[PDB]
Amino acid sequence: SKGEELFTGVVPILVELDGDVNGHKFSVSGEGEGDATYGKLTLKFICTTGKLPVPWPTLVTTFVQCFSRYPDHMKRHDFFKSAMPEGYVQERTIFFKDDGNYKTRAEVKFEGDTLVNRIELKGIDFKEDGNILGHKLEYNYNSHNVYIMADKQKNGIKVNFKIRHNIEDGSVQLADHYQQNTPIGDGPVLLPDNHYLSTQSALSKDPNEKRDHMVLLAFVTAAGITH
Amino acid sequence: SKGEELFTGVVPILVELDGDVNGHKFSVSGEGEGDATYGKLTLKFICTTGKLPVPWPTLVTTFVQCFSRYPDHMKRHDFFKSAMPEGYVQERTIFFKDDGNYKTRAEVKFEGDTLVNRIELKGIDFKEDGNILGHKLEYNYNSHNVYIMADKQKNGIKVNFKIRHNIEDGSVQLADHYQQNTPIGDGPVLLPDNHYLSTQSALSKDPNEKRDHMVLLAFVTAAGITH
Amino acid sequence: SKGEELFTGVVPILVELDGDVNGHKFSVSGEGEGDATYGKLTLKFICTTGKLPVPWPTLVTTFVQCFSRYPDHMKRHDFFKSAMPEGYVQERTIFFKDDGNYKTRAEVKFEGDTLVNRIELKGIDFKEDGNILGHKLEYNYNSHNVYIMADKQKNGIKVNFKIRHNIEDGSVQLADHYQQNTPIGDGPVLLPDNHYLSTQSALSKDPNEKRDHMVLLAFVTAAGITH
Amino acid sequence: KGEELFTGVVPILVELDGDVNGHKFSVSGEGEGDATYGKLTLKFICTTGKLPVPWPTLVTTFVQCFSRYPDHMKRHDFFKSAMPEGYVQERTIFFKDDGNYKTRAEVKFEGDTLVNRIELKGIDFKEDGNILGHKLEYNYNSHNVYIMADKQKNGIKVNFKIRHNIEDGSVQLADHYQQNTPIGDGPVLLPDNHYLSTQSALSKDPNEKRDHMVLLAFVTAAGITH
């Protein structure tokens, strides 16, 4: 696609999130860059309102699948890049098993030379001392496959996966993600055959940073198609 | 699961289809056996009403995913066998791109020692000299991945994939499958995490058979989960 | 490769083996066809000297990897078709754990329009009532990955894998395969990056065949490269 | 038993003495690994000054014991089985149309630290080539690392081919021939054939003045379901 050409090098990224979980309001700003050639992202996020009222790992998926590496033999299946520069809307509901849910809406588009992800998040029905509001999730992250299908009637894609968040007591908290992406612009996009994205995420801290924050490094690679 | 034990050896299979495509009525009977230990199926189908009014390859998917091989580390994700012996209802719409569609409903269950697949099929809006009613498909079959997701809210699974049917002029006819599977019985069943089945199908003819028929050998293996 | 073009359709196959295992001399003739577009082989083998003195499954690997399906994105890695029509020599040692070994030399090449596999096999040091000469192997077959690497100095490849043969008492007999393939002709061949072949095999009988025999259907697909 | 040593975060030390076409250098590295996620974080410093070869050419030389082996493949993890006593890792790396590295390393626990001590000899490099001429980009591709048992040495043989992107758009290949053997007398796990899928991110420390490399790696075993 034409949008693909915008990703051949290193692209600066900005992330902005306005959040409300059980009435606790908060904001996060992020910045970094993406190198889709290697399917690699580097981002740092800061809670600018003080302490983040939910665990950092619960927000990883919310904080730019246009940086996925699509191998050459799968390049006609890259919806994300095909929607650029005008972008796409990404909406999710994330159901935390035996707990509350997040609902998110984001616009992912170029603003000048920068890929910008602007999100609104609303979380409801969380348990005051469940794993989320009780901060019981470990500061780590597992590898996942993100399943993608075309949604022709909406000129976009439907996406589903289930994050496994390790809890401090040895158990796992699941977070079931129902996701849709739809183009912002009117130009044609690539609607894919079924496939998946293999995703790895490394969370760390900036030793020079005193605010509540998260450093993220991600690798994302499309797979599953040989026709 | 309990139902898993029913598939440790060779199980006889019967298949019965009653069909109507654009008003053309037909019946097909099938028989053979499955060996889920190897993900292997061998079946022969006969059109008992005369000539089959659609190409045999378009019915391959319609004609027992309980015979899939689930490797030991994925056995908790085998919905199909866990629903046995009482079985499951399998419903599909199959959309032939630029052509008509099949809607099917099937009960797959043990009747005595035999696994029985009883199907009703209705096809509508087919073009009279399209690839299907014009018999323009080659007698062959590609390898496909069948994507499975849980639908817990509806007590079953949702399955999606797109068959590529090779056409006699070198093009491909796409057949987009939307499938739902629901237990028939009351007992506990396994709802899987997202995964796929890798499917290969060999079509052939019985040299001693003068009626319109298809011999089918399949291998199906589950993949995609390491957690 | 130029040799690739010889496999775009269905290609008849002939197999001939002369064997001697612990002094037991036997001969097997086989015939059928291959369709590399689908990675598919169908073959029937007959022991023309009487009863086979070793179990049929032990000879499956010996009885045409040129019929593998190489996906379009991996076609530069298909050594086997590149060596045609002049062909290649395939040599193996097969070490049956806690038992004897087979040593084989085969020529695989076109003779007219037919792909012929002509093999000499020598087996030594088998135990008289071990799993092999004692006929304790089940008539079935598991799926395997066949690992391929280039051998630049021999202008060919080196191949390794270990077959798991199921035994009648529930155990497994291992057969470790050390394999080398070299071109017969002096024309250019394709030397691959490391990859593997995913292989599935279905063994059956011809109900109207009174001779000692085996019917074989195989699917083979190359994988492991996206660069 | 060696498995048990990797359930949590394990500090790492790396020490390399090198000589490439007579150019002597040393590198010290440190960080940690978390095999539960197959994840490594390491920082390397050239302590002798400028590194005389590109940082990417040394990535594979600078602890496969931190690979994630999924539960169904745990019987195939040679690397951890050799711990704490360790293994020797030897390689020849052939750079196509250029010279070669030969390495010998001991990888073992020294107290609670996993330590990788390497000797590297490089020869027959072209002074104007991709390596000594510093024409490799500061990046890294994903690779599969193919492992087989070597029963008669009671270890493994490993082969793969690194693709290093060149500053003009071409690729410099580095064919790795690798062998690992136990240092101790204890039993080890000899695996069935399989591979490790490897991803590597190279970066810089914005406050580090010395010639250095920051590396993050993810490594996961695959290919077995029997």
UniProtKB/Swiss-Prot annotation, chain D:
UniProt-reported outcome of changing S170G: In GFPA; leads to enhanced fluorescence at 37 degrees Celsius. In Venus; leads to yellow fluorescence, improved maturation and reduced environmental sensitivity
Gene3D superfamilies per the UniProt record, alphabetical: Green fluorescent protein
Residue ranges that the Swiss-Prot or TrEMBL entry lists as coiled coil: none
Effect of S67A: Increases fluorescence at warmer temperatures such as 37 degrees Celsius. In GFPmut 3; highly fluorescent mutant when excited at 488 nm
Tissues with expression: Photocytes.
Effect of N193S: In EBFP1.2; shifts the excitation and emission spectra to shorter wavelengths and increases quantum yields compared to BFP
Result of changing M148T: Increases fluorescence at warmer temperatures such as 37 degrees Celsius
The record's account of how the chain is modified after translation: Contains a chromophore consisting of modified amino acid residues. Maturation of the chromophore requires nothing other than molecular oxygen.
Effect of V63L: In EYFP; leads to yellow fluorescence, folds faster and more efficiently at 37 degrees Celsius and has superior solubility and brightness
Phenotype when changing Y140F: In Sapphire/H9-40; exhibits a huge Stoke's shift, with an excitation peak at 399 nm and an emission peak at 511 nm. In Azurite; shifts the excitation and emission spectra to shorter wavelengths and increases quantum yields compared to BFP
Cross-referenced InterPro entries: GFP, GFP-related, Green_fluorescent_prot
Presence of the UniProt keyword Lyase in the record: no
Similarity section: Belongs to the GFP family.
Assembly description: Monomer.
UniProt function note: Energy-transfer acceptor. Its role is to transduce the blue chemiluminescence of the protein aequorin into green fluorescent light by energy transfer. Fluoresces in vivo upon receiving energy from the Ca(2+)-activated photoprotein aequorin.
Name of the protein in its database record: Green fluorescent protein
Species, as recorded: Aequorea victoria
Record lineage: Eukaryota, Metazoa, Cnidaria, Hydrozoa, Hydroidolina
Gene name per UniProt: GFP
